[PDB]
Structures are given as C-alpha cells and as structure tokens.
Design an enzyme around this catalytic site. Sequence first.
Site, PDB file in Angstrom:
ATOM      1  N   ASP B 144       0.807  -1.214   0.000  1.00 52.77           N
ATOM      2  CA  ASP B 144       0.000   0.000   0.000  1.00 52.77           C
ATOM      3  C   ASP B 144       0.848   1.275   0.000  1.00 52.77           C
ATOM      4  O   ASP B 144       0.772   2.083   0.934  1.00 52.77           O
ATOM      5  CB  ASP B 144      -0.948  -0.032   1.204  1.00 52.77           C
ATOM      6  N   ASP B 171      -7.784  -9.365   6.534  1.00 58.04           N
ATOM      7  CA  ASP B 171      -9.053 -10.069   6.386  1.00 58.04           C
ATOM      8  C   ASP B 171     -10.134  -9.575   7.340  1.00 58.04           C
ATOM      9  O   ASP B 171     -11.321  -9.764   7.054  1.00 58.04           O
ATOM     10  CB  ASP B 171      -8.850 -11.568   6.599  1.00 58.04           C
TER      11      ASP B 171
HETATM   12  C1  LIG Z   1      -5.966  -6.273   0.465  1.00 58.85           C
HETATM   13  C2  LIG Z   1      -4.918  -5.350   1.115  1.00 58.85           C
HETATM   14  O1  LIG Z   1      -3.983  -5.040   0.443  1.00 58.85           O
HETATM   15  N1  LIG Z   1      -5.116  -4.883   2.509  1.00 58.85           N
HETATM   16  C3  LIG Z   1      -4.158  -4.014   3.219  1.00 58.85           C
HETATM   17  C4  LIG Z   1      -2.911  -3.836   2.605  1.00 58.85           C
HETATM   18  C5  LIG Z   1      -1.918  -3.063   3.165  1.00 58.85           C
HETATM   19  C6  LIG Z   1      -2.233  -2.470   4.373  1.00 58.85           C
HETATM   20  C7  LIG Z   1      -3.454  -2.638   5.059  1.00 58.85           C
HETATM   21  N2  LIG Z   1      -3.269  -1.899   6.156  1.00 58.85           N
HETATM   22  C8  LIG Z   1      -3.689  -0.637   6.047  1.00 58.85           C
HETATM   23  O2  LIG Z   1      -4.345  -0.356   5.098  1.00 58.85           O
HETATM   24  N3  LIG Z   1      -3.433   0.271   6.994  1.00 58.85           N
HETATM   25  C9  LIG Z   1      -4.039   1.604   6.760  1.00 58.85           C
HETATM   26  C10 LIG Z   1      -5.559   1.857   6.551  1.00 58.85           C
HETATM   27  C11 LIG Z   1      -4.817   2.583   7.662  1.00 58.85           C
HETATM   28  C12 LIG Z   1      -2.688  -0.042   8.062  1.00 58.85           C
HETATM   29  O3  LIG Z   1      -2.454   0.763   8.906  1.00 58.85           O
HETATM   30  C13 LIG Z   1      -2.149  -1.377   8.192  1.00 58.85           C
HETATM   31  C14 LIG Z   1      -1.342  -1.703   9.344  1.00 58.85           C
HETATM   32  N4  LIG Z   1      -1.028  -0.619  10.325  1.00 58.85           N
HETATM   33  C15 LIG Z   1       0.444  -0.194  10.520  1.00 58.85           C
HETATM   34  C16 LIG Z   1       1.542  -0.923  10.009  1.00 58.85           C
HETATM   35  C17 LIG Z   1       2.901  -0.644  10.200  1.00 58.85           C
HETATM   36  C18 LIG Z   1       3.288   0.474  10.924  1.00 58.85           C
HETATM   37  I1  LIG Z   1       5.363   0.936  11.201  1.00 58.85           I
HETATM   38  C19 LIG Z   1       2.228   1.245  11.440  1.00 58.85           C
HETATM   39  C20 LIG Z   1       0.857   0.929  11.251  1.00 58.85           C
HETATM   40  F1  LIG Z   1      -0.089   1.746  11.794  1.00 58.85           F
HETATM   41  N5  LIG Z   1      -0.836  -2.958   9.462  1.00 58.85           N
HETATM   42  C21 LIG Z   1      -0.039  -3.387  10.614  1.00 58.85           C
HETATM   43  C22 LIG Z   1      -1.065  -3.911   8.543  1.00 58.85           C
HETATM   44  O4  LIG Z   1      -0.601  -5.004   8.689  1.00 58.85           O
HETATM   45  C23 LIG Z   1      -1.842  -3.651   7.402  1.00 58.85           C
HETATM   46  C24 LIG Z   1      -1.980  -4.890   6.486  1.00 58.85           C
HETATM   47  C25 LIG Z   1      -2.419  -2.306   7.210  1.00 58.85           C
HETATM   48  C26 LIG Z   1      -4.464  -3.417   4.475  1.00 58.85           C
HETATM   49  N1  LIG Z   2       2.836   8.860  12.503  1.00 59.55           N
HETATM   50  C1  LIG Z   2       2.194   9.880  11.933  1.00 59.55           C
HETATM   51  N2  LIG Z   2       2.682  11.127  12.108  1.00 59.55           N
HETATM   52  C2  LIG Z   2       2.045  12.153  11.538  1.00 59.55           C
HETATM   53  N3  LIG Z   2       0.940  12.142  10.788  1.00 59.55           N
HETATM   54  C3  LIG Z   2       0.477  10.895  10.634  1.00 59.55           C
HETATM   55  C4  LIG Z   2       1.027   9.737  11.157  1.00 59.55           C
HETATM   56  N4  LIG Z   2       0.280   8.629  10.791  1.00 59.55           N
HETATM   57  C5  LIG Z   2      -0.688   9.134  10.065  1.00 59.55           C
HETATM   58  N5  LIG Z   2      -0.635  10.496   9.931  1.00 59.55           N
HETATM   59  C6  LIG Z   2      -1.553  11.354   9.189  1.00 59.55           C
HETATM   60  O1  LIG Z   2      -2.881  11.015   9.531  1.00 59.55           O
HETATM   61  C7  LIG Z   2      -3.751  11.294   8.408  1.00 59.55           C
HETATM   62  C8  LIG Z   2      -4.624  10.095   8.131  1.00 59.55           C
HETATM   63  O2  LIG Z   2      -3.801   8.914   7.955  1.00 59.55           O
HETATM   64  P1  LIG Z   2      -4.479   7.497   7.717  1.00 59.55           P
HETATM   65  O3  LIG Z   2      -5.451   7.143   8.844  1.00 59.55           O
HETATM   66  O4  LIG Z   2      -3.430   6.461   7.604  1.00 59.55           O
HETATM   67  O5  LIG Z   2      -5.386   7.640   6.388  1.00 59.55           O
HETATM   68  P2  LIG Z   2      -4.909   8.232   5.014  1.00 59.55           P
HETATM   69  O6  LIG Z   2      -3.455   8.551   5.097  1.00 59.55           O
HETATM   70  O7  LIG Z   2      -5.723   9.516   4.642  1.00 59.55           O
HETATM   71  N6  LIG Z   2      -5.126   7.069   3.829  1.00 59.55           N
HETATM   72  P3  LIG Z   2      -4.594   5.591   4.461  1.00 59.55           P
HETATM   73  O8  LIG Z   2      -3.232   5.823   5.239  1.00 59.55           O
HETATM   74  O9  LIG Z   2      -4.420   4.562   3.381  1.00 59.55           O
HETATM   75  O10 LIG Z   2      -5.683   5.065   5.471  1.00 59.55           O
HETATM   76  C9  LIG Z   2      -2.847  11.723   7.251  1.00 59.55           C
HETATM   77  O11 LIG Z   2      -2.881  13.137   7.090  1.00 59.55           O
HETATM   78  C10 LIG Z   2      -1.469  11.205   7.677  1.00 59.55           C
HETATM   79  O12 LIG Z   2      -0.415  12.020   7.187  1.00 59.55           O
END
Ligand SMILES: CC(=O)Nc1cccc(-n2c(=O)n(C3CC3)c(=O)c3c(Nc4ccc(I)cc4F)n(C)c(=O)c(C)c32)c1
Ligand SMILES: Nc1ncnc2c1ncn2[C@@H]1O[C@H](COP(=O)(O)OP(=O)(O)NP(=O)(O)O)[C@@H](O)[C@H]1O
Lengths: 277, 304
Positions: B144, B171
């Site tokens: 991603d 999942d």
């Molecule tokens: C079909 C498919 O591709 N699914 C998919 C594909 C890639 C990502 C996700 N996935 C995701 O989307 N997010 C985003 C939406 C907020 C995650 O934060 C997210 C997540 N967190 C995270 C990880 C590492 C660090 I360092 C900080 C974190 F916070 N971890 C631990 C995951 O294992 C996954 C699997 C996440 C789902």
């Molecule tokens: N560790 C971090 N420090 C600063 N900003 C952060 C951090 N993690 C996330 N953000 C910010 O939080 C907002 C939302 O992040 P997030 O919940 O991950 O959704 P998203 O970035 O809009 N799309 P996605 O990350 O795929 O869910 C964004 O403006 C990011 O830049």
Amino acid sequence: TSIFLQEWDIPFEQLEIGELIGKGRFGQVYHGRWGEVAIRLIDIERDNEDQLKAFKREVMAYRQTRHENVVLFMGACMSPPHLAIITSLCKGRTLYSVVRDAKIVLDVNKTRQIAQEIVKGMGYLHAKGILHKDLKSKNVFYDNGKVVITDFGLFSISGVLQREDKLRIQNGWLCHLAPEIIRQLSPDTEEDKLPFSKHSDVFALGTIWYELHAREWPFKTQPAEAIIWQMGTGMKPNLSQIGMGKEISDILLFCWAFEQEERPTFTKLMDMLEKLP
Amino acid sequence: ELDEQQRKRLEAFLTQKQKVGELKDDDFEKISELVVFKVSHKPSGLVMARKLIHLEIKPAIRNQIIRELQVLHECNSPYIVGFYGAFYSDGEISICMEHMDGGSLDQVLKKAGRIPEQILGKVSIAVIKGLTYLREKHKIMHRDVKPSNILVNSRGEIKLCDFGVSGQLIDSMANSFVGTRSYMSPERLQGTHYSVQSDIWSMGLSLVEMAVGRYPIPPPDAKELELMFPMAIFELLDYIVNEPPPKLPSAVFSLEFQDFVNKCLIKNPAERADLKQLMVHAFIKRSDAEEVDFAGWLCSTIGL
Ligand SMILES: CC(=O)Nc1cccc(-n2c(=O)n(C3CC3)c(=O)c3c(Nc4ccc(I)cc4F)n(C)c(=O)c(C)c32)c1
Ligand SMILES: Nc1ncnc2c1ncn2[C@@H]1O[C@H](COP(=O)(O)OP(=O)(O)NP(=O)(O)O)[C@@H](O)[C@H]1O
Ligand SMILES: Nc1ncnc2c1ncn2[C@@H]1O[C@H](COP(=O)(O)OP(=O)(O)NP(=O)(O)O)[C@@H](O)[C@H]1O
Ligand SMILES: [Mg+2]
Ligand SMILES: [Mg+2]
C-alpha cells in the site's frame, strides 16, 4: 406527514422493547413484544419532507405483503424524527451464519432446496412490483428448513453509504452488485439513485448460489478496487475447483450474465433449479 | 546499506525502547487529530501517534493479530518509521508509533504547489531502500504505497509506514474506502499474482503526482498543463488497466527523472524495473550524491 400505528390491520395495544439483537449499519434492531416481534428504530432529520413521504412511499407498499417466504411486515409508526419498522421476529439463525458453521452439512440437495425457497419469496415481491435491492445471506433466515427473506426495500432509505470524496464499501457488498451497478459506483453515489432492477436482484441471488456451495463469498481473496474492475469488465468465478457438476455451475452463468436481459426472471430460475440432480 | 550517522539514532530509538514497557488506553492523553491521533504517553514522556482501527470481532483472532503484529519490534532501519507496541482497548486495536512532525507527503503537497525534482530525488532513495530492506530482511512487500503513507520530519528523515505485516488484519477490517485517487498496480486490479513490482508502480504513480501537483489520471488537457506552469470509480480503474501510463511533461523535468518514472510505470510487471535495477539507474545515482537540506526545505514550506 404522519404515520400512526392505529393505521395498520394488526390490532396494536402495547409494544415492549427488549434487548438489542445485533449491530447493523441501518438503525438499531431490538427484540420486542406485541407475540414476539423485531423492532427497527430509525432516525431521520426533523424537517426533510423528501426523505419522509419517500419513506411513507415504501411502507404502505409493504402493507399489502403476505407470503410464507417473506418476513411479515407488521407496522411502522412514524412520529418524526423517530421512525420504527416492526416485523415478525425470526427464530433460528441467518443463512450467513449457517453457511459458515462447519458442524452443518450443506449437501447439493439441501442447497437446491434453500435456493428454491428464496426464489419463491423473491418472485412474490417482484410480482407485487417490490425490488429487494439488498438481497444477501445476512438478510435470509434458516430454521431447520424454514427460509425467510428480510429487509427488502430498506436500502433506498438506508444511508449506509453516507469520508471526503471516498465511498465506504462493506465487505461482501460488491460481490452482490450486478455489473450495471458496479460500473457507476462513485463517492457521489446515493442509494436513492442507483439503477436497481429485477435483473439486479437475480444477480444477487447468483452470489448466494455461489456462497451456498463454496461456503464463502466470491472474490474473497481480493480488495475492493480489484473486485470493482473485475466485476465491471465481466470476470466471474465458476465452481469446478471444488468438483461441482455442470448444472450447478450453469446456474451462475445465467444469474451472473453480463448483459441484464440474459438473466432469467425468478419464475424461470425456479424451473432451472427444479431440473437439478 | 550502512551509515554511521543513522546508526546513531537507530540505537537512540532502542533507548526509548526500554522506557515503554507495556501500554493500554489511560496511559495516553489526546493532543490533536491528524483515524490517528497525537498522543502523550504517561509512564514514559514519549510523544507518539496512535492508530485506531475499529474492529468488532472474536476472542482468538485478536491475540493472533497482535502476535502477528509483534514482527514490527524486530524490523528496524532508517527508512521505516518506529514501532512501540500493539494492544486492544474498547473494540479498537491501537498501534502506537513514532510521531512525524511534518506529516504525509500528501500533507506537504497540498500546502506546497508542487514538489521539486531534487527533493523527490531523495524521496525516491528513501522508498527504494525501504522496500529493498523489507523484502530481503523480512520477506514482506508493502502492498500500500501512496503519498499519504510516506512521512517526513523536521530532522530530515523519510520513511514508509502502513504496510502489511499481519495477513489476518487484512481479512478482519470490515470495510475499505474507495475514492477517486487509486494507486493500485494494473496487475493487482486484474487479480494476477504480484510481487514487490506492484509497490514500484505505486511509487512511480506517486512521484508524478507530487511533481505535477495533481493526480495524473485522467491526464490533463493542454489547457490545464499551461495553467499549472466528474468520473465514476470503475472507469478510472479501467483507465489504469487499458490506457497508456501517465508520463511527466517533457519540458520541465530532467531526462534522468522522466526515464525513472517511465520505468516504474511500465504495465507489464516483468519489464518494470525491479528494486535494485532502480538503484543503479542514472537518476538516483545522480541524486544520491547531491546536497539538499531536506529539513530546511520542509520547515520553510509548511512553517515549523
Ligand atoms: C488487500 C490489502 O492489500 N489490505 C491491506 C494492505 C496493506 C495495508 C493494510 N493496512 C492498512 O491499510 N493500513 C491503513 C488503513 C490505515 C494499516 O495501517 C495497516 C497496518 N497498520 C500499521 C503498520 C505498520 C506500521 I510501522 C504502522 C501501522 F499503523 N498494518 C499493521 C497492517 O498489517 C496492514 C496490512 C495495514 C491493508
Ligand atoms: N505517525 C504519523 N505522524 C504524523 N501524521 C500521521 C502519522 N500517521 C498518520 N498520519 C496522518 O494522519 C492522516 C490520516 O492517515 P491514515 O489514517 O493512515 O489515512 P490516510 O493517510 O488519509 N489514507 P490511508 O493511510 O491509506 O488510510 C494523514 O494526514 C497522515 O499524514
Ligand atoms: N426479524 C429479525 N429476526 C431476528 N434477527 C433479526 C431480524 N432482523 C434483523 N435481525 C438481526 O439484527 C441484526 C441487525 O440486522 P441488520 O440491521 O439488517 O444488519 P445486517 O443486515 O445483518 N448487516 P448490514 O445490513 O450489512 O449492516 C443482525 O444480527 C440481524 O441478524
Ligand atoms: Mg439484515
Ligand atoms: Mg496511513
């Protein structure tokens, strides 16, 4: 502008509200007593006259329904902003849960029988000009052979889609949507304005036919965007990977047909399910 | 794949490692929103960011997600953000992280007008080393990559986050959000087997967006290109799969940069440049050996 509970053919003296039955995206759904009942409390803007007579639109259509495969619509009192839809309470488990419990055998004879029940009910709703628009296994109930459809028509007034230029997509929604619908989902999509049809409802049945035999939804592996593109351009699974015969697989080719006019009505589908082994 | 001034703060991260112990809700006081929040840990004065992932779901599964997540304590490198712990509180698992003063590169792009090539030069090495690290040190691909998940700080580091550690957490989350900006590779949309090649395409697409100041599909008409210097989800995805990939404008960017993105955006993932093919590419070997004060560029543009 008002619906009273004295407006219904079910004489109603008192209505008790018990515990919450489950979580759900459209209102809350409580146990209740009337006989035992299922109460769905929905809330609406105070002064949105459009949403409201469009709700009233729907409910007294339901007032004309009675069919052994369709949950009994009992009443809907509406003193805005608080609405309520009152239906019979289903004993037993939802088809979703039954399919996903390994202790239950789902032989090919049983899966044909469950599917014919759903079809009979859907034919009734269609005969009265009522589209379901959200037919799925969480909206079908199974208690030792008894099969009942629920939640027909609610999706129009639902609001389950409601982020900034980002559509919210629940797991297992997309794989029920026929391609004509998938091809126009957008962050501006409103449930009021999607092109649902009798053909879209037959497609959604096809998804249930897949689910009855694979015991999981199609496109389980794949993310939402992949499902959108794969289903928009017409790509669909079969069930030969689990040793299902041609007849069982042909059901899908008809129900999931890419051009709508090629899918059968529920009457024709009822025949097709009769002629299985 | 070694430097001593980044061996300096990797280890001073593992000194604030000891300070955390274990974590649950009341340790944290909310400061501001950035869904994720800026938090203040109390047993340990560390200022972190806390994820919130609302899940509504079984006994045995959580235990096996958090233990699948514990892989992030192990992974450490200057091109990946810092992981502290993972716990469950109140129908919402919460990952606590290293906080980032600058935000996502999506954040900085909307404040800036466009991002200059020399900076996205350095951005490109940060991403390619990150993905190379994760593949050959942990056998995981990111899955991603997009601008919102590349984070930057006023100290000057660029590192990736929000990548796939736990095959189950994929999942278990019930609903995804699909907008008008997609970064999924053409091979991933068609349901074909994929590798870290997909992450390279996602990188390429993010780079051209940051260089132009606009999501590049569908490409702009001659009128909006002059200026810069209503579409359904399906037909955007179909554009990604069947129309030729986007390319930078020939005028304003160097040949090395244009060929870089062009190799990242090849449809056929076999002909697409692989990870370290990219690291001997002219564009980043030129960019590696340049002096740009990244910290200075950042603080002047967002204001901190
Ligand atoms: C079909 C498919 O591709 N699914 C998919 C594909 C890639 C990502 C996700 N996935 C995701 O989307 N997010 C985003 C939406 C907020 C995650 O934060 C997210 C997540 N967190 C995270 C990880 C590492 C660090 I360092 C900080 C974190 F916070 N971890 C631990 C995951 O294992 C996954 C699997 C996440 C789902
Ligand atoms: N560790 C971090 N420090 C600063 N900003 C952060 C951090 N993690 C996330 N953000 C910010 O939080 C907002 C939302 O992040 P997030 O919940 O991950 O959704 P998203 O970035 O809009 N799309 P996605 O990350 O795929 O869910 C964004 O403006 C990011 O830049
Ligand atoms: N008539 C009924 N009898 C028994 N249980 C019911 C009845 N109607 C709804 N339920 C249950 O009440 C809960 C909420 O139902 P509902 O609001 O339709 O959500 P859902 O259809 O299961 N999932 P979704 O619509 O996709 O958000 C679920 O556990 C249903 O199984
Ligand atoms: Mg339901
Ligand atoms: Mg993120």
